[PDB]
Design a protein around this ligand. Structure first.
Ligand SMILES: O=c1ccn([C@@H]2O[C@H](COP(=O)(O)OP(=O)(O)OP(=O)(O)O)[C@@H](O)[C@H]2O)c(=O)[nH]1
Ligand SMILES: O=c1ccn([C@@H]2O[C@H](COP(=O)(O)OP(=O)(O)OP(=O)(O)O)[C@@H](O)[C@H]2O)c(=O)[nH]1
Ligand SMILES: Nc1ccn([C@H]2C[C@H](O)[C@@H](COP(=O)(O)OP(=O)(O)OP(=O)(O)O)O2)c(=O)n1
Ligand SMILES: Nc1ccn([C@H]2C[C@H](O)[C@@H](COP(=O)(O)OP(=O)(O)OP(=O)(O)O)O2)c(=O)n1
Ligand SMILES: [Mg+2]
Ligand SMILES: [Mg+2]
Ligand SMILES: [Zn+2]
Ligand SMILES: [Zn+2]
Lengths: 310, 148, 310, 148, 310, 310
């Protein structure tokens, strides 16, 4: 079978460069030639212990594009009998007797990994576990980069915004570091700097990175400008008023951008990207979101089907 | 001369630092057995000044079990005894993983509420030991993990 | 057509021994040979006026395993227009014009029975009505007993825990009393004793039952040990601390258990069954839950299809 | 004889039931000291078949401290040692109060997660010991309190 | 100083018969001759961690009738969130630097007792701690009985309703048991009987008590009919319907009542006492509530004023 | 009249060294000799738009100790709904026709200052306005330091914890900087360092300060150890776990402490100060809270009473 057959998808740290390339190749193929009955008769659990409408809709749409059926829940602080009292372990022990795969998002780190220990032969796909991993966001990001740039090596990638608390930028950086010759530009307020353990990881692999006060320092060289949201609720309102200037993007900032350059953003964007960026050929955050469908399709297909008939 | 006399057969864990002997007994559930156990705490030591000492008869430890002592008694000497002879000595080597005994310092880690054993990946750093939780994938200094 | 065709499934009191055997035989058959298109083009309403995630997921999974489509809701204290104001009668009058069957769970006793009076030719399946009935839990329990013991007659059944307020133990006792030669052991705090009307029912049929202070009195004889949850929220915390001892199960309690003996529990279990029981060959509460899929499939198939092509 | 040799000065708690010695060590924090401690677990006993044994040098227990052993080691013999000779023998008797070591089984009791020591009045009732929490004033069988 | 000067008032079991008499005698005096300036320049904390409007207004009114100032709060809003990780110990350590006495009500048993260990020389009065104690309710009850019956010895006292979970009846029973010749009648559904430990206490003291299924059995010989609320939330509604007749009182039930007989209820009485009782000379629950003022004044005066009141 | 008669008390930056001394001197006097009728017939509004039980009880107790009457409210219930479209301006314009002074706490910075523009001749005292000012906390802190150290000049003051977001440490630093010869030690995680603008202010005045990674570095030379709370909600829990050791205090940390050294904390101290500190002679946080009463009395007296207190 294919290397991802019946595998749990929990952490970018567990996926090799070959794994990533395989998901991306599969996503390209399904995008070009859909297989709406591939997962016919499969039932997949969509378990959002933590609510996330955008991610859930994306995932469930991917399930339906392959013909699978879907059951699930999205949880505020409350759903029903067992929870609050019963362990996540018991919840998974039960649900894994119902379904062919579990997609789960949860507020506590490690929740998806724990689920694998109780799901028996049922594969678990992590849709987000606290501030730890979100591997399918990273896969859709990589797919979008590869599709627009034609490669995942020898790129110039700027990351802008809240680099300290963004689990998606951490994961994207780890994933890109599995490839060769990439160079990073980190543009963030000192209070929201990319963490040292990420910098240490890059140093150990001899991967170049530098800090910059504004995106104009490096705009002419950038292939991918990956913007994140500022977790302003962590910040003092005055402080948030003082930072945003160097981390807000407008169409005028793109004047010396390369033709190939794409602006990415996992969304929601509210303040970070002015609406005037939307019309430029560089705006790619909606296309990026649309790519979630193919990356998530590829993952479900690879995990639940032995052989890739294309 | 020996306050805790020699044994015929089993394991003697020597050169345990003071205030660690009782900790070893607790953490590794050493007293949950019917075998005869003899213990000295705060004994004098040439190498160490003072020490703890644990003897468990008719019981033997794998190299990996000895390595699980590394974090608490790095200078321990594990003696294998038979016919009143020391037939083997070994020192703990920092192992690759540490299970069951540590508690993840991340309060939001799933490990806390749940029927699972803690598990950490171990890697040595210049001035401490980094411990990375299997579950939350956060890495902490051993000084943080051991402090609870 | 089969005797359950287009019938409402409201109460265990309405089902004969033959009815129960038919559902169980059908569940065994679908478990061995699935029919993923049997209910193709059927639309079923999953109406959880009272939220119950475990039961709802189980039921909806059963619907998808037969190829049916699903619409529905799960209600906190609120969903939308009509409810709070409009009668359950009107709600059913409307929904029954949409769908081919209604599965419903509701906080008031009798709610499913009332629904049958307004659903026209649309069958209603009761997923739980207050402290009254939960017939599909009872069917999955019986299926699990029959599958593991090979019979539903001449059994030794211990019931342990909150026997006073457990609607599932009441129903299971009534159902087992439709069969011959069964003997019961009731192990419960005086405050949570099996109710007299249940004991009266057993007496009238000459069915043997006895009370015991601990499961050790009868462990060597037990075929099925059916544990329930203590509704501790009804109890004083000190009282709950005092009772739990004789009604908590650990692996060591199973030392003289018969080889055939299974531990069942409708779940959630939190305190009642120690996790060390889980590894023993006697733990069967997760398998029991998984059997909900086949019992619920059998019911939908029998109610919505005239003839059992196997 | 004596795997665990005689001491010159201190206390020897003899006749501890098997699997209780370590529990005494934990509960009463006996190893939180710099005094030399020697211990035998699962030792043969004429009176008991087997037993645990705890020696703590240069350390003596009040009659009230001896009584706290009663629930765990009712037949314990607490020996006072000075100049290598046994000077006194006492057995514990039921105390009127047990502080610090027990946990109130009432989950709604204020004692949990508050900076207070647990405290129970001790009341004998033919067979079992009844324990009444100083705080919630609820009374439990000792079996219930010891269970957690 | 008087025996209760600067004493904590936590539990009926710490109060001797002499203490109870002293409180009652002081209450009678303040009722006959008000002392509106006795506690002038005292500041008292009214700390209702659990809300209890009737009890709080009663207590604060008592503080004002003696001329004291009041600061306080009422929670049961921050029920287990928002309500900090700050210990009750710290809260009391702080508040005891502000005020001259602390009146507190709390959902956890032992809270007032814990408070005394952090209040320094500031007395705490227990306005109720979970299902444990409520001594000022018992003191107003005893005062009311003493006033209407002329004595607290040799009485025939019936207690009706939820005898199992009523902290108020447990305490009134303990208090009356400090006096001589009292005779108890316990009228309760089996599921809600007076607990064995109360019965053991009476047997130990050689005090006569009997169980009765209805009020009518003993109406002709009772001096006090103490009714309590049966909270529905513990019972099944059908169970509640089935037993309620025996713990409900209406005017016609009083036909053979002694002329001196008073009906008491700590309130609310909504189900248990029919409004037609209100106009009988036996209805004494509102007068009882009124006496709360004098009992609580007496306690505040004794605890905060060195010399006996004249 | 005294310098503070009929003055608004809004910001530490509007209070001179002479003002601070005057408040402290008045506080010492009222502590030594109470004046329980000084503000007789004054009515004061306790307006807690944001709830703050500890601060409110402290303030209201102070009002009562001077014999004033109190009216007020506490919100943080109507948090941004129910809470009207009615302006704070209008609310103050109304309330200032009712009362003689307004004590207010509010979630928005500048609220008390805005209040003064609509309060006419009614003084407003700021009980806290968002992350801006909390001058009466600073006044009780200074009083406590002055009392225990004999002076407010030439002190060695360590501040530990969340120096970045603590309004209370910012203000205490500004206040102490009005005096001469003070030396500051700032112990904080890099992510929570004392802000540059505070540092600039000290440099401008030629005041010495140094940064230190742990308390142990300076324990032997500090006169005041002012600890603050690190609220977890801003930090990642793993980040919180990693830095907490350096801002946590336990009794053994005090081995080399000066005999005069006091440990202060505006409270709650739940994580930062271990309960074993409580019994040391250095623990002074509860005495500190107690001094809130005298600082707040002094302020109320000075603002509402023309002549100096004797
Ligand atoms: O098996 C033993 C070993 C040691 N001891 C007691 O421990 C003390 C030291 O006895 P040692 O024999 O261990 O001396 P040492 O020089 O070898 O010590 P190290 O540097 O290796 O640490 C002595 O007091 C002895 O009685 C025992 O009682 N039993
Ligand atoms: O101080 C001691 C006492 C006893 N022991 C060891 O315990 C075992 C019993 O030695 P004992 O000396 O305790 O025999 P006993 O008959 O007095 O036992 P009891 O009935 O009083 O319980 C022997 O194996 C001995 O070596 C010690 O090692 N040290
Ligand atoms: N029959 C035996 C033999 C030895 N030992 C213990 C005594 C020592 O604590 C340990 C090691 O024995 P050694 O004779 O090797 O003592 P050393 O001091 O020489 O070895 P080391 O250098 O490791 O300290 O084992 C024992 O309990 N019983
Ligand atoms: N210098 C000494 C003397 C005695 N002991 C220990 C040995 C015994 O375990 C316990 C009691 O000593 P006894 O000599 O009294 O032993 P007995 O068997 O005679 O007393 P008992 O009947 O109480 O067991 O104290 C000791 O550790 N050191
Ligand atoms: Mg040696
Ligand atoms: Mg002996
Ligand atoms: Zn972890
Ligand atoms: Zn308790």
């Amino acid at each position: 079978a294919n290397p991802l057959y019946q595998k749990h998808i929990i952490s970018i740290n567990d996926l090799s460069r070959d794994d990533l390339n395989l998901v991306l190749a599969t996503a390209a193929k399904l995008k070009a030639n859909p297989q709406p009955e591939l997962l016919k008769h499969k039932v997949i659990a969509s378990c959002f212990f933590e609510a996330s409408t955008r991610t859930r809709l994306s995932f469930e749409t991917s399930m339906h594009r392959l013909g699978a059926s879907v059951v699930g829940f999205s949880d505020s602080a409350n759903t029903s009998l067992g929870k609050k009292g019963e362990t996540l372990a018991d919840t998974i022990s039960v649900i894994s007797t119902y379904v062919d795969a579990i997609v789960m998002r949860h507020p506590q780190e490690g929740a998806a990994r724990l689920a694998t220990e109780f799901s028996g032969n049922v594969p678990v796909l992590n849709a987000g576990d606290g501030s730890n991993q979100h591997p399918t966001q990273t896969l859709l990001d990589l797919f979008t980069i590869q599709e627009t740039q034609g490669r995942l090596d020898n790129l110039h990638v700027a990351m802008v915004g809240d680099l300290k608390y963004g689990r998606t930028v951490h994961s994207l950086t780890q994933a890109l570091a599995k490839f060769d010759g990439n160079r990073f530009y980190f543009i963030a307020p000192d209070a929201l700097a990319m963490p040292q353990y990420i910098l240490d990881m890059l140093d150990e692999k001899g991967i170049a990175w530098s800090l910059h006060s504004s995106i104009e320092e490096v705009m002419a060289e950038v292939d991918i400008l990956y913007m994140t949201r500022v977790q302003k609720e962590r910040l003092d309102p005055s402080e948030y008023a003082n930072v945003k200037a160097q981390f807000v993007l407008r169409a005028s900032d793109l004047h010396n951008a390369k033709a190939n350059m794409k602006v990415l953003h996992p969304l929601p964007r509210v303040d970070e990207i002015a609406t005037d960026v939307d019309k430029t050929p560089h705006a790619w955050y909606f296309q990026q979101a649309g790519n979630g469908i193919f990356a998530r399709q590829a993952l479900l297909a690879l995990v639940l089907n032995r052989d890739l008939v294309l | 001369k020996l306050q805790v006399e020699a044994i015929k057969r089993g394991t003697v864990i020597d050169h345990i630092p003071a205030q660690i002997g009782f900790k070893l007994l607790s953490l590794f559930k050493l007293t949950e057995t019917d075998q005869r156990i003899t213990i000295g705490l705060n004994l004098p030591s040439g190498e160490m000044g003072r020490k703890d000492l644990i003897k468990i008869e008719n019981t033997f430890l794998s190299e990996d079990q000895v390595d699980q002592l590394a974090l608490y008694a790095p200078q321990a000497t594990v003696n294998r005894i038979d016919n009143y002879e020391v037939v083997g000595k070994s020192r703990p080597s920092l192992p690759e993983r540490i299970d069951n005994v540590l508690v993840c310092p991340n309060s939001n880690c799933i490990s806390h509420a749940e029927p699972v054993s803690s598990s950490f990946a171990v890697r040595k750093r210049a001035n401490d030991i980094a411990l990375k939780c299997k579950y939350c994938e956060k890495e902490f200094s051993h000084n943080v993990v051991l402090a609870n």
